[PDB]
Amino acid sequence: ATFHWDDPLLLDQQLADDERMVRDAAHAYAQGKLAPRVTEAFRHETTDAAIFREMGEIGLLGPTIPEQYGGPGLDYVSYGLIAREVERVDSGYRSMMSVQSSLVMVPIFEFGSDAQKEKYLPKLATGEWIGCFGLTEPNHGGSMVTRARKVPGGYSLSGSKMWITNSPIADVFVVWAKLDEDGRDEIRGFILEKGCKGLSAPAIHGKVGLRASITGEIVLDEAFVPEENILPHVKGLRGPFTCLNSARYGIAWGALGAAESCWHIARQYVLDRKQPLAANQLIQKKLADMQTEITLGLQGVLRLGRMKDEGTAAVEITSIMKRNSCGKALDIARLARDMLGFGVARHLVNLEVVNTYEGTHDIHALILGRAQTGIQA
Amino acid sequence: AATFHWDDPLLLDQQLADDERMVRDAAHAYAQGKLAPRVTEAFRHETTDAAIFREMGEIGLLGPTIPEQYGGPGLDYVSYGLIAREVERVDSGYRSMMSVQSSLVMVPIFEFGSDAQKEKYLPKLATGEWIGCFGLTEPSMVTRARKVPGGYSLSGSKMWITNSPIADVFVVWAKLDDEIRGFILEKGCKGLSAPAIHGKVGLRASITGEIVLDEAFVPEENILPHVKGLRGPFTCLNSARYGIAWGALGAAESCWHIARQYVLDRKQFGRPLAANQLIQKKLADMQTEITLGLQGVLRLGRMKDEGTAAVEITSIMKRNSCGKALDIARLARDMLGGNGVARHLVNLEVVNTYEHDIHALILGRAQTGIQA
Amino acid sequence: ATFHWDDPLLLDQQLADDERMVRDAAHAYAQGKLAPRVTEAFRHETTDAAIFREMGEIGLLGPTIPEQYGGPGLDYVSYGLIAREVERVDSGYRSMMSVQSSLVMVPIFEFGSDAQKEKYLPKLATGEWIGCFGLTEPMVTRARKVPGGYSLSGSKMWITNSPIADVFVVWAKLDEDEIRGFILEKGCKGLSAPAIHGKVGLRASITGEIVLDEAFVPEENILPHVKGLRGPFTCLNSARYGIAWGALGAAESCWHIARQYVLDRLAANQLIQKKLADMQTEITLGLQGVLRLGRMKDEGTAAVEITSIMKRNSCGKALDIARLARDMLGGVARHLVNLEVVNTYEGTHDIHALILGRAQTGIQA
Amino acid sequence: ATFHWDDPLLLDQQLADDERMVRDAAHAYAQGKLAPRVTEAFRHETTDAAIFREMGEIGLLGPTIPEQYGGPGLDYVSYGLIAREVERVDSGYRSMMSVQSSLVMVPIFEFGSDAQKEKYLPKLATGEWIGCFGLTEPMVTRARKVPGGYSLSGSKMWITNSPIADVFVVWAKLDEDEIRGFILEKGCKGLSAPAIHGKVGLRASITGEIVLDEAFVPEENILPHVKGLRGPFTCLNSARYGIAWGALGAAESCWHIARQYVLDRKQFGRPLAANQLIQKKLADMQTEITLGLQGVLRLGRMKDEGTAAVEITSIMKRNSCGKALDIARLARDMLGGNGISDEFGVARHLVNLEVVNTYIHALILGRAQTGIQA
Ligand SMILES: COC(=O)c1cccs1
C-alpha cells in the first residue's frame, strides 16, 4: 500500500463513482472558468452574474432539488463536493452558489405551494433567475424587526435586511418577517420579485473580504406581496433554520476546499524556496498540522453528509462541522500566510469574513454547549 | 428530526459491526468492573498487578488480531482499537501493559517467527499465562548477538522496558553479523537479568525495568527467522502506535466527561458553571476533537483491515490523538478549582513525550521528499 | 556587545548593589537548604517548619517590614527577588513565605495597634512564630460582641501554614456588617486547625483549615485601623506581587532544565529552538514588568490594577513554560503540578482579566 | 495612586524630557499630516514623495545621525519613539522612514568615505534626497572593475522607495584578492527603477525594482570601510530595532480601536464590554503591549550605553511583530461586518503586519543559547 500525502485516508475511494464524476465536473468548471476571473474579480469587486447560468447549465445549482423541479436530484455528499470545488477557487463564488441552493431553492422546495415550486424552482435551477435571502438586519441576531402587515390582497412589507449576497442582481427574494396575526407574532417567509414597488437592493462596496461576490441590502417600504407569495407551509424558527442548516453544511465542505488551496500553495512554496525550506522542522510541523486538520475535517463532513442522506443526522452535528471547518480553515490560511515571502491572502480575508458572518459570539459553540449541558449560556 | 447524541455525535456505535460492538462492550465491562476500582490506589502507590494479563487473556483481549489457530481471538484492527480505548478510558498504564503483549510481543512472533515459535509462545501469551516484554530502547544500537554452537550469545542493556521485571517472554533486538535481528528469550535463561525501576511520574500503574544481557545463550530455534533490519522493530511500533491512537481518545473522553459533570455540579455567582460562555467553548472543543479523532482512527482501522493503509497514516493518527487528548486533559485540569483528571494528564504527558516529534517529521518527508 | 542568553536585558545591571546581594542571599539559602530538601518533601508531603526558623534567621521574612519591628526594612524589588529565588526551588516553599510576609506581617504592620505590632512582628520576622491567613471559606464567618472581646464562629479552608501556625489572622464580619481582622493564638479555645492531605500540587507546603467554634478574642486583638474589603485586599495585593516574581523563578528553572536537556543530547532542532526562544522571550519580558512594578511601588506611583497585569502574566506564562519544558523531556514535572495549582488558586474565571477589563472600559463583567 | 489604562507602567515617566518632546513632535506630525492621508493612500496605492521633506524638516529622518551631517543627533530611544508614532498611523509610512534612516543613512555614515557622508547625508536628512536599499533579489548582482571605477549588472526586487529614490545603496559582489556596497544616483545610465503595483500589504508605500545593466559607478562611490556580511547586516539590524518599536504602535492602534468598538456596541441587551471573553482579550492586548514596550525601551537604553548585543534586537523584533500580529488578528476577529466602518482600519494594520512579520530570529536565539547552528 502506498501513501497519498494529498489524500491520506483515500476520501476518493470512500466516494461512489457517481460522486467522483460530480466532483470532477465541479472541479473542471471552477478551474476552467472561475480561476481565470478570480484575481481581478476580487481586486476590483466586479459584479459577475454570468456564473449562475454557467453552474445552472451543468446542474450544480440546488443539487439536492429533485428533477421534477429542474434540480439534478443529487445527495448531500455531492452538494458538499460541489461547494468544496467552488471554494477551492474562492469563498465568494461558493457564497453565491450557497445562497441559490440552500437559501432560496430549499425554502421554496420545502415550504412553498405547488404553484410556487413550479413557478420559481426551474428558473432558479438553470440560473435564469438569481435568488437572495433576507434574514439578517442592521444589527441584532426572533428579535427581528422586519414586519408584514395584512392588507387587502396580501401583505405589506417594511424593514431592512443587510449583508445580503446576490441582492443587487437577484430576480427572486426570500424574506423573513414577523406577521402579527391575532394575537400571535410569528416569523413567515415571503417571496418577492425584482421590480416590486417598494423593494430596493442597494450594493455594498469597499468590502474587506468576499470581494468577488456582489452583496447588498434589501430595503422594504410598504412592498406589496400578494397572498399567493407567502410561504404557506412554515412558521417560526423552522423556516429560517432549515435554510441556515443547509447552507452551513455546504460551507463546512467549502472551507476545507479553501484550506486545501492554502496548504498546497504553502507546500509548493517551501519545495521551490531555497534557504530548500522543506528541510526545516518548524516548516514540516506546519505542513503536518495542515494535512492533519484537513484530513480529519474531510472525514467529519463526509460522515455528516452520509448521515444526512440516510436521515440520521441531528441538526447539532452541522454546528460541529461548520464551526470546525471554518475555524480550522482560517488557522490554515494564517499559517500558510505567515510562511510566504496573492492567492493565500485572498482566501485569508475571505475566511476572516466567513468565520465572523454568523456573529462574533461563537453561536455554534453555544448550540453545542447547550446540547451537552441542557443549559443556554 | 433525528436525535442528537452529545456523547457520540457521528454515531460511531452505528458504524461498528456487531462483532466489534460486542468486543467493545466486553472490554468495557472488564475495565469498569476490574480496573476502575483498582486504579486510584495502584497509581498512588505504584502497586504492580500483573493479574490483568491473566484476566484480559481469559476474555480474549490480548493479541486481538492474532488468529484462533494460535490462541488469539482473531479480531480485526477496529476491534483492537476499541479494546485499547476502553482500557485507556480507565488508565494509560493498563493500556501500556496491553500494548506491549499484543503489539510489541505477539505481533513480532506471529509476523516474523517460525511455526515452532508461534505454536509455543503465542497460545500462553494470548491467555496471559506468559507475560511478554519488548527489548529495543537502550541507556546506532549497542546490544549485539554473536554466533556460537547451538545458537547465539547476547550482551548489552535495554532500559525503560515495560513489563520486564515480571516478564516470562522477552523479544529482544540485537545486531548480528550488521543487521538488527529479533531474539526470543525466556525468564530463567542464564545470562538474562531484568531488574525493576521505581518512582515514575506517569504510567505508575504499570511496572517497567531493565533487560541486562551478558553472554545470554539463545538457541537456534529462538532467533526470529523471517526479519532483518529496521523492519522488525518498526512493524511492532507501528502496531502499538495504532492502539495508542485509539487509547488516547478513551483517556480524552474520560477527561471530557469528568469536566462536563464537574461544570454541571459546581456553581458560580448563582448559575451552574455549565452556564458560562467560556466553559461551553471548551466543552465544544473537547467534543469536536474527540469526535473527529475517532472518525480518523476508525477509517485507519478499516483501511488496515482492507490492506489499503500506508504506514504514514499511523503517524497522523497517533500524533493527533495523543496531542489532542493531552490538550483536553490540560483543558479539563485547568477547569477544576481545588487541589481522575490529574492522573490522566500525567499519564498523557508520558505517552505524548515517549518517542523529537518524530511523526511531524515523518509526515514532512512524506509531503516534501526531504528528511530533516 | 556581549550576549547573555540567561539574562538578555541584563537585569543584573538594572539592580542596585544592595538589591543584587539580597537576591544572591536568597539564592544561596534556597539552593543550600531548600533544594536538597524538596524532592522528598514533595514526594511525601512532609512538614518542615525549620524553614521559618532558617528564613527568619537571615531576614527573608516580611522583607518590607521596618527594622524597628525586626524586619530587614527592604523595598519591593528586594521582596520580589527573594520570592523568585525561593520559588525557583519550589512554589510550596514560596507559598509558606508569602503567607508570613504578605498575609500575616503586612496586615499586622499596616492595620495593627502599637501593642499588636510590638508583640507579633519581631517573632514573625525571626520565624519563631508562624502565621496563617484566614480568608477563604468552604463570607459567613461572623464576629459576635461579648464581654471581652469578640466571639468568632465559622470555618476557613485551604489555609497554608495553619496546622503549624502560632498566629492566625482571621477575617470575619461584624455589624454596628463590615469585615474586620482578628488575631488568634495556638491554644485558644474554640480554635482548631486540622491538616489537609493528598494534595496534587504544592505538596511541599503544609495546608489545613481554621475551625472557629465560638473562639474568644480579646479587644486588644482586633485590627483598629481596618474595616471592610480593603483589609483582605491589601494582603492579597501584597501576595500577588510576590507571586508575580515567584512564578518567574519557577519558569526559569524549567527553561534552564529544558535548555540543558537538549544540550546533553537535540539543540540543532528548529522546533526546539523556537520553544527555547519563546521561554527566553516571555521570561525576559515578564521580569522587566515585575521590576518596573517594583520600582513604581517604591515610588508610590503604582496603582493596584498593575498587580493584576503582572500576576496574571507571570502565572499564565510560567504555566505555559512549564508545559513547554515538560513536552521536551523524555523537577520540571513538580514545578508543573505546582504551577497548575497556582494558576487556579484565585479561581477559574480569570479574576485579573475582569479587573483589567473593567479598568479599561468602566463596565463590570 | 491612579491607574492609567493606556500606559499602565507610565512609560511617559521613564522617558527623558528630551525624548518626550521628540515623541510629541512625531505624534503631532503623524496624526496631523499622515492620518488624513492614509485610508485613500492605502486604498489606491498612492505615491506621495512629499512626505520625506515633511519628515526631514522636523528631524525625523536618520534620528541617530550626528548634527555634523544634518542629522538631529538623537539617541536610540528617540528613534524608537518616532517609529512607534509613525507606525501608529500606518506601517507603510514607517517603512519609508526606516529605509531612509537605517538602510540608507546608516550604511553611508557607518561605512562611507568622508566625502560620501558630506555629499549624501545632509540632503538625505532634510528629505531633499530620497534613498533606497538594494539587497533583495528575484546574491547574483555583480560589480566588475573597469577603467575609472565599477560596472554593475544585476537586479533587485521589492525595494521600497526605489521608483522615487535619488540615492541607491546597492550591495553587489566584487571579486578582489565578496559583498560590497555601492552608491548610485538617479539618472545613472543602465539604471532603471520600475514600480511594483498591486501589493497586498504596505500599499501606502511605493516599492519597485532596481535593474542595473552595465551601470557605471565612479571610484569614489564604493563604500570603503565594509566587506562581506557585516555591511547589509548592520543596516538590517538598525532597521529591525525601529520595526520593534513601530510594530507596537500598530498594535496600540488595533487595541484602541477594539476597545472603542466594544464600548459603542451592544449584544443581547448589554454593551459588548460587559462580556467576559471580550475583557480577557482586552486584558491580553494591554498586557502584551505594556511588556513589549518595557522590552524595546530597555534595548534602546542598552544600545545608547553601548551594551546591547545583536541578539537582543532579534528577540525584540520577533516579539513585537509576532505579538502585534496576534493583536491585530484578535481585534479583527472581534469585529462584525465587512469593511465599511472606521474599525476596519484594523484590517489595514493586519495586512501590513502580515508583510512586516514576514520581511530566522528564533534560530538566532536558539544558537545563542546553545552554540549549535540550526
Ligand atoms: C452565504 O451567506 C450566508 O448567509 C451565511 C450563512 C452562514 C454562514 S454565511
Author numbering:
A (entry chain C): 4 to 144, 148 to 281, 285 to 350, 358 to 393
B (entry chain D): 3 to 141, 149 to 186, 191 to 352, 359 to 374, 377 to 393
C (entry chain B): 4 to 141, 150 to 187, 191 to 279, 286 to 350, 359 to 393
D (entry chain A): 4 to 141, 150 to 188, 192 to 373, 379 to 393
What text does the study give?
Unlike other flavoproteins within this family, GCDH (EC 1.3.99.7) performs α,β-dehydrogenation as well as decarboxylation of its sub­strate glutaryl-CoA to yield the product crotonyl-CoA. Transfer of electrons from the glutaryl-CoA precursor to the electron-transfer flavoprotein is mediated by the cofactor flavin adenine dinucleotide (FAD) in both prokaryotic and eukaryotic electron-transport chains. Like other ACDHs, GCDH from B. pseudomallei (BpGCDH) exists as a homotetramer with tetrahedral symmetry and possesses an overall fold similar to that of the human enzyme.
All fragments identified by screening which bind BpGCDH occupy the pockets that bind the glutaryl and flavin moieties of the substrate and cofactor, respectively. In three of the four ligand-bound complexes fragment molecules occupy the binding site for the terminal glutamate of the glutaryl-coenzyme A substrate. The crystallographic water coordinated to the Arg97 side chain in the apo structure of BpGCDH remains in place when FOL544 is bound, but is displaced by FOL239 and FOL6421. In all three of these cases the Tyr373 side chain is rotated approximately 90° from its position in both the apo BpGCDH structure and the human ternary complex. However, a conserved backbone deviation is observed between the structure of apo BpGCDH and those of all four fragment-bound complexes in this same region. This perturbation results in a new orientation of the catalytic YEG motif. Thus, the binding of small metabolite-like ligands induces a conformation in apo crystals of BpGCDH that partially fills the FAD-binding site with protein residues.
